[PDB]
Write a protein that binds this DNA or RNA. Structure first.
Length: 64
DNA sequence: ATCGTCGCTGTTCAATACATGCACAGGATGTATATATCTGACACGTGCCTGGAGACTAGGGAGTAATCCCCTTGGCGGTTAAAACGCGGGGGACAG
């Protein structure tokens, strides 16, 4: 439903193949797992244990 | 005796000197700017030629319609795990 919502803002009356959604979910979770890995490394660098939004913002800024 | 005055002292009060917190001139070191000067890299002009333009053909790639059926959407209900809400406190964040 979320992907249909985001796509609805681009073009109306669209149908999705089930495999297309699964591929979007696979790449999305892999991106999010990789981001939290970089986020946890940033939080540990700040002598912390808890991840915080400033860690994600710094990580994505360095990533470009 | 009896009173007053003169040697011996402490205790407080005031005045002065010192120490600590704060701002404002004063210099010097760098930056910005003003100026003179000389330069070589850019812009133009010329001359020369290779790649773009023109004209035609042949041919297959793409556009077009007509049919197919596969895939996508959709609705429905049933247990069911996962989400959600709340509580309590501990250890992790954050500041000194």
């Amino acid at each position: 439903r979320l992907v249909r919502e985001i796509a609805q803002d681009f073009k109306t009356d669209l149908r999705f193949q089930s495999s297309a959604v699964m591929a979007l979910q696979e790449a999305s979770e892999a991106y999010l797992v990789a981001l939290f890995e970089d986020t946890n490394l940033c939080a540990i660098h700040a002598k912390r244990v808890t991840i915080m939004p400033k860690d994600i913002q710094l990580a994505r800024r360095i990533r470009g």
